[PDB]
Design an enzyme around this catalytic site. Structure first.
Site, short mmCIF file in Angstrom:
data_model
loop_
_atom_site.label_atom_id
_atom_site.label_comp_id
_atom_site.label_asym_id
_atom_site.label_seq_id
_atom_site.Cartn_x
_atom_site.Cartn_y
_atom_site.Cartn_z
N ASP A 85 29.00 3.23 49.92
CA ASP A 85 29.04 1.99 50.69
C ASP A 85 29.69 2.23 52.04
O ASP A 85 30.88 2.56 52.12
CB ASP A 85 29.79 0.89 49.93
CG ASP A 85 29.73 -0.46 50.66
OD1 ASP A 85 28.73 -1.19 50.51
OD2 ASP A 85 30.68 -0.78 51.40
N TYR A 108 32.74 0.58 60.14
CA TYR A 108 33.72 1.51 59.60
C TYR A 108 33.89 2.77 60.43
O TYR A 108 34.77 3.58 60.12
CB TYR A 108 33.33 1.93 58.18
CG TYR A 108 33.22 0.81 57.18
CD1 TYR A 108 33.70 -0.46 57.46
CD2 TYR A 108 32.64 1.02 55.94
CE1 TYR A 108 33.60 -1.49 56.54
CE2 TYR A 108 32.54 0.01 55.01
CZ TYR A 108 33.01 -1.24 55.31
OH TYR A 108 32.89 -2.23 54.39
N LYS A 151 25.67 -1.83 56.84
CA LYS A 151 25.85 -3.26 57.09
C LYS A 151 25.70 -3.56 58.57
O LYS A 151 26.20 -2.83 59.44
CB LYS A 151 27.21 -3.75 56.60
CG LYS A 151 27.56 -3.34 55.17
CD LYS A 151 28.77 -4.08 54.68
CE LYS A 151 29.26 -3.52 53.35
NZ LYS A 151 30.03 -2.24 53.56
N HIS A 161 26.83 -8.20 57.21
CA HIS A 161 28.21 -7.89 56.84
C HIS A 161 29.03 -9.16 56.62
O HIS A 161 29.90 -9.20 55.74
CB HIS A 161 28.85 -7.02 57.92
CG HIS A 161 30.03 -6.21 57.46
ND1 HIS A 161 30.35 -4.99 58.00
CD2 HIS A 161 30.96 -6.46 56.51
CE1 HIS A 161 31.43 -4.51 57.40
NE2 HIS A 161 31.83 -5.39 56.50
N1 LIG Z 1 31.82 -6.26 52.84
C1 LIG Z 1 33.07 -6.36 53.26
O1 LIG Z 1 33.45 -7.29 54.00
C2 LIG Z 1 34.06 -5.39 52.70
C3 LIG Z 1 35.42 -5.63 52.81
C4 LIG Z 1 36.31 -4.74 52.23
C5 LIG Z 1 35.84 -3.64 51.56
N2 LIG Z 1 34.50 -3.40 51.44
C6 LIG Z 1 33.99 -2.19 50.71
O2 LIG Z 1 34.67 -1.95 49.49
C7 LIG Z 1 35.45 -0.73 49.57
C8 LIG Z 1 36.60 -0.83 48.59
O3 LIG Z 1 37.46 -1.90 48.93
P1 LIG Z 1 38.84 -1.52 49.65
O4 LIG Z 1 38.62 -0.48 50.70
O5 LIG Z 1 39.52 -2.77 50.04
O6 LIG Z 1 39.69 -0.77 48.51
P2 LIG Z 1 39.83 -0.81 46.91
O7 LIG Z 1 38.58 -0.26 46.28
O8 LIG Z 1 40.31 -2.13 46.50
O9 LIG Z 1 41.01 0.26 46.74
C9 LIG Z 1 42.35 -0.08 47.17
C10 LIG Z 1 43.21 1.15 47.02
O10 LIG Z 1 43.19 1.60 45.65
C11 LIG Z 1 43.54 2.96 45.62
N3 LIG Z 1 43.00 3.54 44.40
C12 LIG Z 1 41.70 3.95 44.19
N4 LIG Z 1 41.49 4.43 42.99
C13 LIG Z 1 42.72 4.32 42.36
C14 LIG Z 1 43.15 4.67 41.06
N5 LIG Z 1 42.35 5.20 40.14
N6 LIG Z 1 44.45 4.44 40.75
C15 LIG Z 1 45.25 3.91 41.69
N7 LIG Z 1 44.96 3.54 42.94
C16 LIG Z 1 43.66 3.78 43.22
C17 LIG Z 1 42.97 3.58 46.90
O11 LIG Z 1 43.99 4.42 47.46
P3 LIG Z 1 43.72 6.02 47.60
O12 LIG Z 1 42.71 6.20 48.70
O13 LIG Z 1 45.08 6.60 47.97
O14 LIG Z 1 43.22 6.53 46.26
C18 LIG Z 1 42.69 2.37 47.80
O15 LIG Z 1 43.28 2.52 49.08
C19 LIG Z 1 35.63 -0.50 51.08
O16 LIG Z 1 35.99 0.86 51.25
C20 LIG Z 1 34.22 -0.94 51.56
O17 LIG Z 1 33.35 0.14 51.30
C21 LIG Z 1 33.60 -4.28 52.01
C1 LIG Z 2 36.10 -8.63 55.38
C2 LIG Z 2 36.56 -10.04 55.71
C3 LIG Z 2 35.92 -11.09 55.06
C4 LIG Z 2 36.30 -12.40 55.32
BR1 LIG Z 2 35.36 -13.75 54.40
C5 LIG Z 2 37.32 -12.70 56.22
C6 LIG Z 2 37.98 -11.65 56.87
C7 LIG Z 2 37.60 -10.33 56.61
N1 LIG Z 2 38.27 -9.32 57.29
C8 LIG Z 2 39.57 -9.24 57.62
O1 LIG Z 2 40.43 -10.07 57.36
C9 LIG Z 2 39.93 -7.96 58.38
N2 LIG Z 2 38.76 -7.54 59.18
C10 LIG Z 2 38.61 -8.24 60.48
C11 LIG Z 2 38.76 -6.10 59.35
C12 LIG Z 2 38.78 -5.12 58.19
C13 LIG Z 2 39.85 -4.39 57.87
C14 LIG Z 2 39.82 -3.42 56.79
O2 LIG Z 2 40.76 -2.72 56.44
O3 LIG Z 2 38.63 -3.26 56.11
C15 LIG Z 2 37.49 -3.99 56.42
C16 LIG Z 2 36.31 -3.77 55.68
C17 LIG Z 2 36.27 -2.73 54.56
C18 LIG Z 2 35.16 -4.50 56.00
O4 LIG Z 2 33.98 -4.33 55.32
C19 LIG Z 2 35.18 -5.43 57.03
C20 LIG Z 2 36.34 -5.65 57.75
C21 LIG Z 2 37.50 -4.93 57.46
#
Ligand SMILES: NC(=O)c1ccc[n+]([C@@H]2O[C@H](COP(=O)([O-])OP(=O)(O)OC[C@H]3O[C@@H](n4cnc5c(N)ncnc54)[C@H](OP(=O)(O)O)[C@@H]3O)[C@@H](O)[C@H]2O)c1
Ligand SMILES: Cc1cc(Br)ccc1NC(=O)CN(C)Cc1cc(=O)oc2c(C)c(O)ccc12
Length: 318
Positions: free
Chosen positions: A45, A50, A79, A112
């Site tokens: 993803d 990013y 996205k 996105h």
């Molecule tokens: N569409 C959107 O608006 C949006 C927004 C946010 C995220 N996303 C997508 O979803 C992804 C994941 O969400 P996120 O980046 O917020 O993080 P997440 O998957 O919630 O992970 C949070 C933290 O968990 C840690 N972690 C991972 N595996 C672990 C394990 N087995 N045990 C303990 N800790 C662990 C990681 O640290 P370490 O790296 O140190 O392992 C990571 O920094 C993003 O990278 C992106 O691809 C999309």
């Molecule tokens: C995602 C979202 C959804 C709603 Br609804 C309301 C607010 C937000 N974003 C924030 O509040 C912070 N935004 C501006 C940057 C941001 C920081 C970051 O660390 O990761 C991101 C990832 C993994 C994204 O895919 C998109 C953005 C970010």
């Protein structure tokens, strides 16, 4: 280990999250994406936002060249960022993402966020007063442009991210709609489990894809440092000891057993490989109910800068 989307394509139910904050060198995304593929992740993803599609694509290219995988084994998501919602900007944005990643197609292209922003070079346009410069775009016209990207084979599937029920309904009810969104990628974890939105998506054959499923990276720029830490939750931790797993594996398995496709970001080799063990155990029905009770309506991403946006998705119940 896939779910069949409403356009007939298949999405692996465990996805690798690639986002890292700007302080992390860009070479890390290359290294860890290779480790994720080596560990068995096949769903990757990414996003224009990013600033890592070039490195993620280089990782995919490397693992194809050394024989580990074929292109068709990998499910790659990008996205469309919110400055590109105006329809004439959609296909060039996808073509730019494909050029950076050096891919011929993405398996999935998402809007996105519904929160359209002023078109231009800046990803975060800000006015003289420091306010985010929103744009107003009929997202059905953005969607029509997304459909032409799938028609042209540049995106095998199209979907949305961060939409609420009303915003999904606008697409689903659009006259002449050609392709339903295959998914809605949203914040989803035990403290914000999106049960009502999940039930609506299921009733329409839309997959809910969970992000921040492990509680987010808690970036101090966007997440309250005082919010509770998901993986420190006493119920998740007791379930982890009961099952001889980890709190993260409980949180990921929770999503898989409720029909949610789950993303997991890790830049750590041991944790990357641990996360693929989600397929090795099951939670009981009573375990699932216990996790269901944890919902706190806690959005880890909660800045007031976006709450005033006219398309902010959290002004509705779900
Ligand atoms: N569409 C959107 O608006 C949006 C927004 C946010 C995220 N996303 C997508 O979803 C992804 C994941 O969400 P996120 O980046 O917020 O993080 P997440 O998957 O919630 O992970 C949070 C933290 O968990 C840690 N972690 C991972 N595996 C672990 C394990 N087995 N045990 C303990 N800790 C662990 C990681 O640290 P370490 O790296 O140190 O392992 C990571 O920094 C993003 O990278 C992106 O691809 C999309
Ligand atoms: C995602 C979202 C959804 C709603 Br609804 C309301 C607010 C937000 N974003 C924030 O509040 C912070 N935004 C501006 C940057 C941001 C920081 C970051 O660390 O990761 C991101 C990832 C993994 C994204 O895919 C998109 C953005 C970010």
């Amino acid at each position: 280990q896939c779910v069949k989307l409403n356009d007939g394509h298949f999405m692996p139910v465990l996805g690798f999250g690639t986002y890292a904050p700007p302080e992390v060198p860009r070479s890390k995304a290359l290294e860890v994406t290779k480790l994720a593929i080596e560990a068995g992740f096949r769903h990757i993803d990414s996003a224009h936002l990013y600033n890592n599609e070039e490195q993620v694509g280089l990782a995919i290219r490397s693992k194809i060249a050394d024989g580990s995988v074929k292109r068709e084994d990998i499910f790659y998501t990008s996205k469309l960022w919110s400055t590109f919602h105006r329809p004439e900007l959609v296909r060039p944005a996808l073509e730019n993402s494909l050029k950076k990643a050096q891919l011929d197609y993405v398996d999935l292209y998402l809007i996105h966020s519904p929160m359209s922003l002023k078109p231009g070079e800046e990803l975060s346009p800000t006015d003289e007063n420091g306010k985010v410069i929103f744009d107003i775009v009929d997202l059905c016209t953005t969607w029509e442009a997304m459909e032409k990207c799938k028609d042209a084979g540049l995106a095998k599937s199209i979907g949305v991210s961060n939409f609420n029920r009303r915003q999904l309904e606008m697409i689903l009810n659009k006259p002449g709609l050609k392709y339903k969104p295959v998914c809605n990628q949203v914040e989803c974890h035990p403290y914000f489990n999106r049960s009502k939105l999940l039930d609506f998506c299921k009733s329409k054959d839309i997959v809910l894809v969970a992000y921040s499923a492990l509680g987010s990276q808690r970036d101090k720029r966007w997440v309250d440092p005082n919010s509770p830490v998901l993986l420190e939750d006493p119920v998740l931790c007791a379930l982890a000891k009961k099952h001889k797993r980890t709190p993260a594996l409980i949180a990921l398995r929770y999503q898989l057993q409720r029909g949610v496709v789950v993303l997991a970001k890790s830049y750590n080799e041991q944790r990357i490989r641990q996360n693929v063990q989600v397929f090795e155990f099951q939670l009981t029905a009573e375990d699932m109910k216990a996790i269901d009770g944890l919902d706190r309506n806690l959005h880890y991403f909660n800045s007031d800068s976006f709450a005033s946006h006219p398309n902010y998705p959290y002004s509705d119940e779900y």
